[PDB]
Design a protein around this motif. Structure first.
Motif, PDB file in Angstrom:
ATOM      1  N   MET A   1       6.721  -7.458 -14.352  1.00 52.37           N
ATOM      2  CA  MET A   1       6.075  -7.437 -13.009  1.00 52.37           C
ATOM      3  C   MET A   1       5.720  -5.981 -12.740  1.00 52.37           C
ATOM      4  N   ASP A   2       4.627  -5.768 -12.007  1.00 58.82           N
ATOM      5  CA  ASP A   2       4.132  -4.454 -11.655  1.00 58.82           C
ATOM      6  C   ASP A   2       3.393  -4.590 -10.333  1.00 58.82           C
ATOM      7  N   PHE A   3       3.068  -3.453  -9.715  1.00 63.21           N
ATOM      8  CA  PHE A   3       2.408  -3.465  -8.404  1.00 63.21           C
ATOM      9  C   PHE A   3       1.019  -4.089  -8.457  1.00 63.21           C
ATOM     10  N   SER A   4       0.225  -3.813  -9.497  1.00 63.15           N
ATOM     11  CA  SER A   4      -1.149  -4.389  -9.600  1.00 63.15           C
ATOM     12  C   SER A   4      -1.164  -5.928  -9.659  1.00 63.15           C
ATOM     13  N   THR A   5      -0.202  -6.500 -10.354  1.00 56.16           N
ATOM     14  CA  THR A   5       0.029  -7.911 -10.512  1.00 56.16           C
ATOM     15  C   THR A   5       0.487  -8.515  -9.175  1.00 56.16           C
ATOM     16  N   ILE A   6       1.377  -7.817  -8.476  1.00 57.35           N
ATOM     17  CA  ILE A   6       1.762  -8.250  -7.140  1.00 57.35           C
ATOM     18  C   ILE A   6       0.557  -8.196  -6.208  1.00 57.35           C
ATOM     19  N   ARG A   7      -0.261  -7.141  -6.311  1.00 56.81           N
ATOM     20  CA  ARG A   7      -1.427  -7.028  -5.443  1.00 56.81           C
ATOM     21  C   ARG A   7      -2.438  -8.199  -5.691  1.00 56.81           C
ATOM     22  N   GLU A   8      -2.648  -8.574  -6.924  1.00 53.35           N
ATOM     23  CA  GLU A   8      -3.574  -9.673  -7.260  1.00 53.35           C
ATOM     24  C   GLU A   8      -2.996 -11.038  -6.776  1.00 53.35           C
TER      25      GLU A   8
ATOM     26  N   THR B   1       0.846  -1.210   0.000  1.00 54.06           N
ATOM     27  CA  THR B   1       0.000   0.000   0.000  1.00 54.06           C
ATOM     28  C   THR B   1       0.876   1.252   0.000  1.00 54.06           C
ATOM     29  N   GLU B   2       1.941   1.265   0.790  1.00 51.53           N
ATOM     30  CA  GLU B   2       2.816   2.395   0.913  1.00 51.53           C
ATOM     31  C   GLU B   2       3.578   2.612  -0.436  1.00 51.53           C
ATOM     32  N   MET B   3       3.924   1.535  -1.090  1.00 52.14           N
ATOM     33  CA  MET B   3       4.574   1.621  -2.429  1.00 52.14           C
ATOM     34  C   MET B   3       3.550   2.134  -3.461  1.00 52.14           C
TER      35      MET B   3
ATOM     36  N   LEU C   1      12.013  -7.542  -8.699  1.00 48.51           N
ATOM     37  CA  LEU C   1      11.867  -7.754 -10.113  1.00 48.51           C
ATOM     38  C   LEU C   1      11.356  -6.520 -10.818  1.00 48.51           C
ATOM     39  N   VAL C   2      10.425  -5.810 -10.201  1.00 45.21           N
ATOM     40  CA  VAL C   2       9.864  -4.565 -10.722  1.00 45.21           C
ATOM     41  C   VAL C   2      11.042  -3.553 -10.931  1.00 45.21           C
TER      42      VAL C   2
ATOM     43  N   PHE D   1       5.027   2.101 -12.323  1.00 41.56           N
ATOM     44  CA  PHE D   1       5.002   0.710 -11.770  1.00 41.56           C
ATOM     45  C   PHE D   1       3.615   0.212 -11.426  1.00 41.56           C
ATOM     46  N   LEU D   2       2.608   1.041 -11.526  1.00 37.65           N
ATOM     47  CA  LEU D   2       1.263   0.718 -11.012  1.00 37.65           C
ATOM     48  C   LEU D   2       0.563  -0.391 -11.833  1.00 37.65           C
ATOM     49  N   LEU D   3       0.843  -0.401 -13.134  1.00 39.72           N
ATOM     50  CA  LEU D   3       0.144  -1.262 -14.087  1.00 39.72           C
ATOM     51  C   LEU D   3       1.127  -1.959 -14.954  1.00 39.72           C
TER      52      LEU D   3
END
Length: 115
Positions: free
Chosen positions: A54-61, A23-25, A80-81, A34-36
């Motif tokens: 790799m991206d943050f949305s993919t990590i979040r899912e 969340t902080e990232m 990796l991002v 990096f969001l998408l």
């Protein structure tokens, strides 16, 4: 070894604490590159060069759906991002600088939360 174990580190809060870090990232002002997922149709060279996008949305899912077996597999996808970003972007670019900043930010949070 068999019937010989180190004392059990409490991992019951790892999921929650990785979600908070993430969340902080997500909310950092320099998170925008990096969001998408990078659009592989619209960014020449990305598909061939970056073997594991790799991206943050993919990590979040992945996080939300139990696809990280432990906190180290989570840290590997975050790094990796940034490794991808350094592979593709000059250090002296906005995105290049974004990536260095975010990696620093992540690594401090990681150390302070877990080490």
């Amino acid at each position: 070894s068999m019937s010989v174990k180190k004392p059990k580190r409490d991992d019951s809060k790892d999921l929650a604490l990785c979600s908070m870090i993430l969340t902080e990232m997500e909310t950092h002002e320099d998170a925008w590159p990096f969001l998408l997922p990078v659009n592989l149709k619209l960014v020449p060279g990305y598909k061939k060069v970056i073997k594991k996008p790799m991206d943050f949305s993919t990590i979040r899912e992945k996080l939300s759906s139990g696809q990280y077996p432990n906190l180290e597999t989570f840290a590997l996808d975050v790094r990796l991002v940034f490794d991808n970003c350094e592979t593709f972007n000059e250090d002296d670019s906005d995105i290049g600088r974004a990536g260095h900043n975010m990696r620093k930010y992540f690594e401090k949070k990681w150390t302070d939360t877990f080490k």
